[PDB]
Design an enzyme around this catalytic site. Structure first.
Site, short mmCIF file in Angstrom:
data_model
loop_
_atom_site.label_atom_id
_atom_site.label_comp_id
_atom_site.label_asym_id
_atom_site.label_seq_id
_atom_site.Cartn_x
_atom_site.Cartn_y
_atom_site.Cartn_z
N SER A 25 -0.66 15.51 -12.08
CA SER A 25 -0.92 15.16 -13.46
C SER A 25 -1.14 16.40 -14.29
O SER A 25 -1.67 17.40 -13.80
CB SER A 25 -2.14 14.24 -13.53
N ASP B 75 0.83 -1.20 0.00
CA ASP B 75 0.00 0.00 0.00
C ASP B 75 0.86 1.25 0.00
O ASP B 75 1.36 1.65 1.03
CB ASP B 75 -0.90 -0.03 1.24
#
Length: 330
Positions: free
Chosen positions: A199, A35
């Site tokens: 992004s 994770d």
């Protein structure tokens, strides 16, 4: 040193991925959820409340000759989906894919929430976010990666998750045969303890690319792709019959649909998520309403590039002094 381990979807939907981990002497192999959105290595154990164990493999520290109770240390964690676990702490030898760390903090669960109990396939989590998020008290502990880093050939790990198929976590090297083209690297902020990056934009299907900054985290421990409501609405508007359902808890769509792809930007590069990756199947057994793999982050407070996005790429978690993230197509 290096390590290399195969990671395997837990079910036919890729709801999560499990990777075998050796703990203790002799080894006890548990299947953990790696994770990159958290920083605790915790396991079902011989100390876990009996009624809260249902089919998981447990760690029994008393059977490990290298286990040592970390005196006075406790841990307690609550995840974004509302799940939780807590307990005490041992140090022991932990190996992943041939890479060994001695003295790793292994957090032994005394209590786990129902969602963990109800999933027999996950024996615990192995956190790969920054150690500043580790919950051990009163002395915070380091992640497996943090402990291994100085020994690694290169201070990196990579995630190569499969779509409906196994994939690979590598530590300490970049497998240049595992991706196509080049790896595009992008800046990371560690201020919230995550692999947080920005992004450069998105496209829906064959549509034009929208240049827009989308801050979010690369999180292997989250199944879906959570993005701003504007972006998500633009995606689902291209699917006939798709709608946001408050009763179901997100966007659903007719299971008869063919989904469009979703592209996200990494600098000037582009990662394309095929439409099929976005189908998470019937909302309930036998239903013709299917759950979408792209959902709104509104209310979460952060955008999350979970498995739906990451599985479309070869992803480098670069733990150099100034960390960065790399993405390649594959």
């Amino acid at each position: 040193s290096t390590g290399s381990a195969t990671t395997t979807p837990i079910d036919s939907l890729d709801d999560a991925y499990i990777t075998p981990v050796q703990i203790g002497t002799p080894a006890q192999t548990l299947n953990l959820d790696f994770d990159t959105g958290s920083s605790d290595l915790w396991v079902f154990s011989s100390e876990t409340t009996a009624s809260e164990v249902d089919g998981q493999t447990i760690y029994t520290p008393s059977k490990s000759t290298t286990a040592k109770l970390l005196s006075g240390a406790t841990w307690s964690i609550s995840y974004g989906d509302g799940s939780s676990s807590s307990g005490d702490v041992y140090t022991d030898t932990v190996s992943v894919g041939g890479l060994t760390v001695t003295g790793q903090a292994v957090e032994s669960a005394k209590k786990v929430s129902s969602s963990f109990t109800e999933d027999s396939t996950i024996d615990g989590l192995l956190g790969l976010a920054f150690s500043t998020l580790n919950t051990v008290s009163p002395t915070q502990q380091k992640t497996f990666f943090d402990n291994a880093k100085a020994s690694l050939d290169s201070p990196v790990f990579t995630a190569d998750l499969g779509y409906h198929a196994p994939g690979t976590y590598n530590f300490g090297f970049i497998d240049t045969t595992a991706y196509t083209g080049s790896i595009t690297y992008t800046a990371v902020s560690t201020k919230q303890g995550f692999w947080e990056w920005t992004s450069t934009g998105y496209a829906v299907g064959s549509g034009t690319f929208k240049s827009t900054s989308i801050d979010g985290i690369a999180d292997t421990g989250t199944t879906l792709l959570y993005l701003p409501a504007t972006v998500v609405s633009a995606y689902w508007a291209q699917v006939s019959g798709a709608k946001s359902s408050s009763s179901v808890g997100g966007y659903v769509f007719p299971c008869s649909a063919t989904l469009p792809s979703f592209t996200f930007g990494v600098g000037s590069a582009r990662i394309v998520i095929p439409g099929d990756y976005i189908d998470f199947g019937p909302i309930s057994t036998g239903s013709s309403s299917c759950f979408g793999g792209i959902q709104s982050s509104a209310g979460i407070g952060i955008n999350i590039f979970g498995d739906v996005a990451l599985k479309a790429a070869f992803v480098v978690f670069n733990g150099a002094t100034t960390p960065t993230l790399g993405f390649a197509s594959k």
